[PDB]
Amino acid sequence: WTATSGSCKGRCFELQEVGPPDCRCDNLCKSYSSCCHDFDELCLKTARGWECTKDRCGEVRNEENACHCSEDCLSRGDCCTNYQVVCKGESHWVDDDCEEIKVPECPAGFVRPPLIIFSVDGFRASYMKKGSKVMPNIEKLRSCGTHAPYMRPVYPTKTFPNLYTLATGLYPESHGIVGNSMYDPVFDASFHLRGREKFNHRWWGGQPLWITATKQGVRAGTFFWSVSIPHERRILTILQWLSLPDNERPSVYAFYSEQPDFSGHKYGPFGPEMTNPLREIDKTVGQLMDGLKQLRLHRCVNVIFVGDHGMEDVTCDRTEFLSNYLTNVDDITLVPGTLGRIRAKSINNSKYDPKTIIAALTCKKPDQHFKPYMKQHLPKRLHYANNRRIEDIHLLVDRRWHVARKPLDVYKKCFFQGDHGFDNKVNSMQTVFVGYGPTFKYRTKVPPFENIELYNVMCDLLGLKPAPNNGTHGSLNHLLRTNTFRPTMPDEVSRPNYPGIMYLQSEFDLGCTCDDKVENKLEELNKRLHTKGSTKERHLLYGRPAVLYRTSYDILYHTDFESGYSEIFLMPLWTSYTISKQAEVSSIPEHLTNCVRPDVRVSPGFSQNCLAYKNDKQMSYGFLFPPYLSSSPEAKYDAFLVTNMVPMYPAFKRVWAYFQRVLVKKYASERNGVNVISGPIFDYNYDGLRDTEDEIKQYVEGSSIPVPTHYYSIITSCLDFTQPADKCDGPLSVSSFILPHRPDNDESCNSSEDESKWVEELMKMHTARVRDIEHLTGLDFYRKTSRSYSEILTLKTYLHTYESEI
Ligand SMILES: *[C@@H]1O[C@H](CO)[C@@H](O[C@@H]2O[C@H](CO)[C@@H](O[C@@H]3O[C@H](CO[C@H]4O[C@H](CO)[C@@H](O)[C@H](O[C@H]5O[C@H](CO)[C@@H](O)[C@H](O)[C@@H]5O[C@H]5O[C@H](CO)[C@@H](O)[C@H](O)[C@@H]5O)[C@@H]4O)[C@@H](O)[C@H](O[C@H]4O[C@H](CO)[C@@H](O)[C@H](O)[C@@H]4O[C@H]4O[C@H](CO)[C@@H](O)[C@H](O)[C@@H]4O)[C@@H]3O)[C@H](O)[C@H]2NC(C)=O)[C@H](O)[C@H]1NC(C)=O
Ligand SMILES: O=C(c1ccc2[nH]nnc2c1)N1C[C@H]2CN(C(=O)c3cc(OCC(F)(F)F)c4ccccc4n3)C[C@@H]2C1
Ligand SMILES: [Ca+2]
Ligand SMILES: [Ca+2]
Ligand SMILES: [Cl-]
Ligand SMILES: [K+]
Ligand code: NA
Ligand SMILES: [Zn+2]
C-alpha cells in the first residue's frame, strides 16, 4: 500500500527518495507503482515536443510545455536542448571542430568536473565502425576523446551482471548478481527480471559508485531510469540537475538506454531494422552535448559512453534440448538460454547425481553446441564459481546457440533473432568504451581492456577512494590526462633462502634412482658458477617474483633455469627459463627415462619422494623446466632434480608434454625467443585466490605432497619482435594460461586423437591474465624492468583471447 494522495508539486525527480507510504516523485516511483497522482501531469510533460522551432523563440513561458524557448529558460535550466541553435544562431555541438580540452572550463562554483555515464544496452563493439555513417555525435566523441577498439564485458554477458560490474568493479561471483535470473538457497529466494524480489537490497553485494560517492561527500544523481520515462526526459532531467545550486547539484550522473539491445533481440545484431535505433541513440547524445554546450558545460564535464555487452545472431532452430541427452529431464531445474545452470528440482531427492548428469552431457553428439562443466572446472578467466547462487553444474553454450530443457519450453514460452550471455572472450559479445572530457586524453586510442577496470577510473575522475574491487588500480592510467593514481609495488613478505650443498646423496631415502653415475677442473668451476646464479640474468629477465605472504622457500639456480622452491608445498612456486629462437629441442635419452635425482641443496625432509608416486596408482609426475629444452647433455641432469618435479595425472601429462616438447619451441620461433615462468596453483575452494596449506583436499597417496588444481605459465617476449626476448629495449608482450590439472581429458571431445589436434585448443580456452595468476599464487611478477609501473600493470591485465579481428 502507498498513500498516493500527496503531490509532486515542486518535487519532480527529487534527488532524495521519500519514505512510504508518502508518495514518490523520483525517477523510480513508476517501478514501485508509488508515484504521486500528479506525477504524469507535472513531471512527464510532453506538450509541444522536444525541439524549439523558429516561431517559439522568445515566447512567454507556458509551464505546460515539455521544454521551453522563452528568454528565461537558460537561467531556469529548462530550455529544449536545441534552443540556442534555433533562437540564438548557435551551432550544434557535432558541427563544431573539436579542440583539445587541456583544463576543465567550468562555471564558478563547480568544485570538480562532473561525470556523466552514458550507458547503452547491447551496444556491440563493431557498431562503432559499422554504424559510423549514422552516428555523427558518437563518432565525434570517439575520435576526439579517448577510445578503445572494444571493451570486454564480464561473464555471463547479461545485462544486470554487467551493469552492476560497471558500478562496483567486482566480478559477478563477488557482487552477487550472477545472472539475470537466480536462486539463493540460503535466503531460499528467487531473483528475476520481471518482478519485485530484485528490488530487495540483499541481492546486491559490494559498493556501487553512487554509494562510494555519497559516503565520501560527493552528490549523485540517481543511476536508474524506469522504461516509461522517454529518453528526451532523462536528458532534460540531468541538465536540470546540473542547474541546481552548488550545495544541491550532484557531481556524478547516469543515463541509461534500453537500445540497441531491445531491437537487437528482435532483429539480430545487424538486421536492417537496427539502423534506426542507432540513429536515435546518436540523436540523444546530440541533445546531451547541445544541452551541455548551452549551459557552458561541454568543456567541463567528463562523459563516458559505455556498453554492457554486445549482441549475437541466435534463433529458435539453434536450440539444444536436454531432453535429447537426459532420460531424467524432470528431476532437474535448468536456467536456460545462452548459458546453462542445472540443479536438482527437489533437494528431497537423494537419487539426484550431478556426476552422471555431467557424463550424460559430455561429447554425446558429433557437433554438440554446449559443454558441461562442474563450475570449479570452468576457465579461471571467467571467475565464475565462488557464489552459492551459481549452480555446481554449468553449460558453456556455443555462440549463436541456446540450451533449453524440453522442446515445449521453446514453442510454449520464431520470435527472437539476437541474444547475448555467451563467454566474454566472444567477439560478438564485446562492447564499447569512449571517454571525452578534460580528464581524458585528446584523440587517443588505448588497447582493449575489461569493464571491471572502470570503477577505479570513475573513482579517480571524481576524486574518490574506490572500495576494494577486482580492477587493478593504475592499469588504466594511460586513459587519463591527469587524476592518475600512482600505485606502488606491493612489499615482498617472505625473503628467500639461498641454500648451498648441505646434504650427501646417502641421506636421501626417497626410493628414486638415476643412471647418472657416468662422470675436470675447468668445467667444475664453471658448473659451480651456474649453481651460484651465473646465468641468472638470462633466465630471470624481469627479476624474481616477490612472495606476498608468509612462507619458507629457497632460490635454486641452474644453467638453464631458476626456481623458487617451497619447503612448505615441497615443489616450486615458480620456475623461470628463457628459450631463444635458436634453441634446440632434444629428447629424454633412453637411459634417463625414469631418472629422478636428490637435490643436495635441499633436505630429504623438504623433498618429494619417488616411492609415493609408485604407490599412488592415479598420480604420476612431470617437471616444470622441461628436460627437452636442456642446453646440453650435462645440463639435462639438472632437469631431473626432485626439486623440479611436480605431481601430474597421466591424462594431464599428455597436455603438459605437448606444451613443453612442441609449443614452447614454436612460440620461441614465432616471437623471437620467450621467457617462461611456470608453476603450480592450488585453488580447492575455487575462490580465485591462493590456498593456504590447510585448504588442500588432495595429496599424493601416503605423502605430504599436495596436488595442484591447476598449472600456469607466463610467456613473455619483446613487443618489437625484431629484438630477441633476452635483449628487449622497450614494451613487452605476454600470453599466459592456467590449465586445469584433471585426471581425465573429458573436457576435450577430440582427446583420443594426437595432441596436435586438441591440446593447443584446450590451452587457448584456458588463456589467462598475469593478474589472474597473481591472485592464485600470492606472487608479484615483473618486479625489475625498465618500464613504468603503470605500463606493467596494463601488461598484467592483458588477456590473449585468440579470437579473430573485430
Ligand atoms: C574481487 O574483489 C573482492 C573485494 O575485494 C574480493 O572479495 C573479498 O575477499 C576477501 C577475502 O576472501 C573477503 O574478506 C572476508 O570478509 C568476511 C566478511 O565480509 C563481509 O563484509 C564485507 C565488507 O562490507 C562485505 O563486502 C562482504 O560481502 C559478501 O557477503 C555478502 C553477504 O553474504 C554478499 O552480499 C556480498 O556479495 C559478498 O559476498 C561475496 O563474498 C563472500 C565472502 O565474504 C563469499 O562467500 C560470497 O560467495 C561472495 O563471493 C561480507 O558481508 C570475513 O568474515 C572474512 O574473515 C575470515 O577469514 C579471515 C582471514 O583473514 C580471518 O581473519 C577470520 O577469522 C574469518 O574467518 C572466520 O570466518 C570463516 C568463514 O565464515 C570461518 O571459516 C572461520 O572459522 C572464522 O570464523 C574475510 O576477511 C571479502 O568479504 C570479499 N569481499 C567481497 C565484496 O566479495 C575477491 O577476492 C576478489 N576476487 C579475486 C579473484 O581477486
Ligand atoms: O528491460 C530491461 C532489460 C534490458 C536488456 C535486456 N536484455 N535481455 N533482457 C533484458 C531486459 N531492463 C530494465 C532496465 C533499466 N535498467 C537500469 O535502469 C539500470 C541502470 C544502471 O546503470 C546505468 C549506468 F551504467 F549508466 F550507470 C544500473 C547499474 C547497476 C545495476 C543496475 C542498473 N540498472 C537496467 C534494466 C534492464
Ligand atoms: Ca544488457
Ligand atoms: Ca583458494
Ligand atoms: Cl542468467
Ligand atoms: K603413479
Ligand atoms: Na576426451
Ligand atoms: Zn538483452
DSSP 492-525: P-BPPB---S---GGG--SS----------HHHH
Structural domain of 583 = 505-797
Q: Greatest CA separation found in the chain?
A: 105
> What is the phi/psi pair of residue 184, to 5°?
-110, 110
From the CA of 653, the nearest ligand is 6
- Distances from the Cα of 722 to the Cαs of 318, 714, 795, in angstroms? 46, 21, 20
Helix, strand, or coil (residue 480): strand
Ligand 3: centre distance to CA 123 (Å): 8
The answer to whether residues 712 and 736 touch, using CB atoms and an 8 Å cutoff, is yes
How many Å apart are CA 562 and CA 526, to the nearest integer?
Answer: 16
In the chain, count H helices and then E strands.
23, 29
Strand pairing partners for 47?
Answer: 65
Report the nearest-CA residue for atom 29 of ligand 2. 163
Which atom of ligand 1 lies nearest, measured to the CA of 175?
A: 37
What letter would DSSP give residue 355?
H
Q: Say whether the peptide bond before residue 149 is cis (omega within 30 degrees of 0).
A: no
Q: Is 419's C-beta closer than 6 angstroms to any atom of ligand 2?
A: no
C-beta atoms surrounding 184 within 10 Å: 17
Query: Locate cell 577430440: which residue?
Result: 750
Between CA 735 and CA 738, with CA 737 as vertex, the angle to 5 degrees is: 160
Q: Is the dihedral of CA 488, 489, 493, 496 positive or negative?
A: negative
What letter would DSSP give residue 137?
H
C-beta atoms surrounding 662 within 10 Å: 16
Q: For residue 558, what is its C-alpha cell?
A: 641452474
Q: Is 193's C-beta closer than 6 angstroms to any atom of ligand 2?
A: yes
Q: Is 469's C-beta closer than 6 angstroms to any atom of ligand 1?
A: yes
Question: Helices 789-797 and 770-777 sit at what angle, rounded to 10 degrees?
Answer: 90
Spatial CB neighbours of 468, under 8 Å, sequence gap ≥ 6:
none
What letter would DSSP give residue 722?
T
How many Å apart are CA 83 and CA 68, to the nearest integer?
Answer: 8
The answer to whether residues 420 and 121 touch, using CB atoms and an 8 Å cutoff, is no
The answer to whether residues 264 and 311 touch, using CB atoms and an 8 Å cutoff, is yes
C-beta atoms surrounding 630 within 10 Å: 24
Q: Is 174's C-beta closer than 6 angstroms to any atom of ligand 1?
A: yes
Using only C-alpha atoms, the chain has a radius of gyration, in whole angstroms, of 30
Residue 360 φ/ψ region, left for φ over 0, alpha for ψ in the -120 to 50 degree band, beta for the rest: alpha
Spatial CB neighbours of 27, under 8 Å, sequence gap ≥ 6:
13, 222, 224, 225, 226, 229, 234, 237
Q: Is 206's C-beta closer than 6 angstroms to any atom of ligand 1?
A: yes
Q: Say whether the peptide bond before residue 626 is cis (omega within 30 degrees of 0).
A: no
How many Å apart are CA 90 and CA 108, to the nearest integer?
Answer: 23
Spatial CB neighbours of 138, under 8 Å, sequence gap ≥ 6:
128, 281, 282, 285, 305, 434
> What is the phi/psi pair of residue 255, to 5°?
-110, 145
Spatial CB neighbours of 339, under 8 Å, sequence gap ≥ 6:
156, 179, 394, 395, 396, 397, 403, 421, 422
What letter would DSSP give residue 489?
P
* Among the listed residues 324, 325, 344, the one whose alpha carbon sits nearest the alpha carbon of residue 334: 344
Where does residue 523 rank: exposed (0-12), middle (13-18), buried (19+ CB within 10 A)? Answer: exposed
Strand pairing partners for 579?
Answer: 674
Task: Confirm whether 159 is a catalytic residue.
Answer: yes
The answer to whether 420 is a known ligand-binding residue is yes
The H or E element that residue 711 is part of is strand 710-718
The answer to whether residues 647 and 708 touch, using CB atoms and an 8 Å cutoff, is yes
Ligand 2: centre distance to CA 160 (Å): 6
The answer to whether residues 769 and 735 touch, using CB atoms and an 8 Å cutoff, is no
Q: Looking at 408-510, which runs of residues are DSSP E strands?
A: 418-419, 433-436, 444-445, 449-450
How many Å apart are CA 311 and CA 328, to the nearest integer?
Answer: 33
Which atom of ligand 1 lies nearest, measured to the CA of 204?
A: 35
Query: Locate cell 507535472: which residue?
Result: 42
Between CA 423 and CA 382, with CA 315 as vertex, the angle to 5 degrees is: 5
The answer to whether residues 334 and 341 touch, using CB atoms and an 8 Å cutoff, is yes
The answer to whether residues 160 and 170 touch, using CB atoms and an 8 Å cutoff, is no
How many Å apart are CA 554 and CA 561, to the nearest integer?
Answer: 14
How many Å apart are CA 752 and CA 584, to the nearest integer?
Answer: 29
Q: Where are the alpha helices (DSSP H) in 152-295?
A: 159-168, 172-175, 209-215, 231-241, 261-267, 275-294
Helix, strand, or coil (residue 778): coil
Q: For residue 356, what is its C-alpha cell?
A: 552422471
> What is the phi/psi pair of residue 784, to 5°?
-130, 90
How many Å apart are CA 315 and CA 416, to the nearest integer?
Answer: 6
Q: For residue 783, what is its C-alpha cell?
A: 618486479
Q: What is the CATH number of the domain that holds 537?
A: 3.40.570.10
Resolution to one decimal, Å: 2.1
What letter would DSSP give residue 429?
G
Please state the separation of Cα 665 from the chain's center in Å.
30
Strand pairing partners for 456?
Answer: none
How many Å apart are CA 217 and CA 394, to the nearest integer?
Answer: 42
**CB-side exposure of 203: number of CA atoms within 13 Å?**
23
Please state whether beta strands 449-450 and 151-152 pair in parallel, antiparallel, or not at all (unpaired): parallel
The answer to whether 694 is a known ligand-binding residue is no
Query: Locate cell 571517454: which residue?
Result: 435
The answer to whether residues 544 and 555 touch, using CB atoms and an 8 Å cutoff, is yes
Compute the 3-state secondary structure of the chain and give helix, strand, coil in percent, each to the nearest 5: 30, 20, 50
Which of 116, 158, 178, 223 gets mutated to test ligand 2 (max ligand atoms within 8 A of its CB)? 223
How many Å apart are CA 420 and CA 180, to the nearest integer?
Answer: 11
How many Å apart are CA 343 and CA 183, to the nearest integer?
Answer: 10
Q: Is 157's C-beta closer than 6 angstroms to any atom of ligand 1?
A: no
Query: Locate cell 583471447: which residue?
Result: 801
Q: For residue 779, what is its C-alpha cell?
A: 606472487
Spatial CB neighbours of 547, under 8 Å, sequence gap ≥ 6:
492, 493, 494, 496, 553, 564, 573, 778, 779
The answer to whether residues 711 and 681 touch, using CB atoms and an 8 Å cutoff, is yes
**CB-side exposure of 336: number of CA atoms within 13 Å?**
17
Ligand 1: centre distance to CA 253 (Å): 30
* Residues around the ion ligand 6 (C-beta < 5 A): 613, 616, 620
C-beta atoms surrounding 40 within 10 Å: 14
Helix, strand, or coil (residue 394): strand
DSSP secondary structure of 32-71: GT-B-TTHHHHHS--BT-SS--GGGTTPPP-TTBSSB-ST
Helix, strand, or coil (residue 462): coil
Please state whether beta strands 767-768 and 732-740 pair in parallel, antiparallel, or not at all (unpaired): antiparallel
How many Å apart are CA 93 and CA 89, to the nearest integer?
Answer: 13
Please state the separation of Cα 431 from the chain's center in Å.
13
Between CA 455 and CA 460, with CA 458 as vertex, the angle to 5 degrees is: 110
Which of 165, 168, 174, 797 gets mutated to test ligand 1 (max ligand atoms within 8 A of its CB)? 174
The answer to whether residues 115 and 252 touch, using CB atoms and an 8 Å cutoff, is yes
- Distances from the Cα of 433 to the Cαs of 112, 192, 260, 463, 646, in angstroms? 22, 28, 15, 21, 43
What letter would DSSP give residue 701?
T
Please state the separation of Cα 773 from the chain's center in Å.
13
The answer to whether residues 679 and 693 touch, using CB atoms and an 8 Å cutoff, is no
Where does residue 173 rank: exposed (0-12), middle (13-18), buried (19+ CB within 10 A)? Answer: buried
* Among the listed residues 564, 502, 505, 566, the one whose alpha carbon sits nearest the alpha carbon of residue 533: 564
Q: For residue 728, what is its C-alpha cell?
A: 628487449
Query: Locate cell 571467475: which residue?
Result: 383
Query: Locate cell 595429496: which residue?
Result: 699
Where does residue 652 rank: exposed (0-12), middle (13-18), buried (19+ CB within 10 A)? Answer: buried
Q: For residue 98, what is its C-alpha cell?
A: 573539436
Q: Considering 4, 81, 159, 439, which one is annotated as catalytic?
A: 159
The answer to whether residues 783 and 542 touch, using CB atoms and an 8 Å cutoff, is yes
The answer to whether 685 is a known ligand-binding residue is yes
- Distances from the Cα of 302 to the Cαs of 180, 236, 252, 289, in angstroms? 30, 18, 10, 11
* Among the listed residues 308, 345, 339, 307, the one whose alpha carbon sits nearest the alpha carbon of residue 326: 345
How many Å apart are CA 97 and CA 140, to the nearest integer?
Answer: 9
The answer to whether 689 is a known ligand-binding residue is yes
The H or E element that residue 738 is part of is strand 732-740
Q: For residue 280, what is its C-alpha cell?
A: 536515435
The answer to whether residues 237 and 487 touch, using CB atoms and an 8 Å cutoff, is no
The answer to whether 72 is a known ligand-binding residue is no
Q: Counting every residue, how long is the chain?
A: 806
The answer to whether residues 183 and 343 touch, using CB atoms and an 8 Å cutoff, is yes
How many Å apart are CA 253 and CA 113, to the nearest integer?
Answer: 12
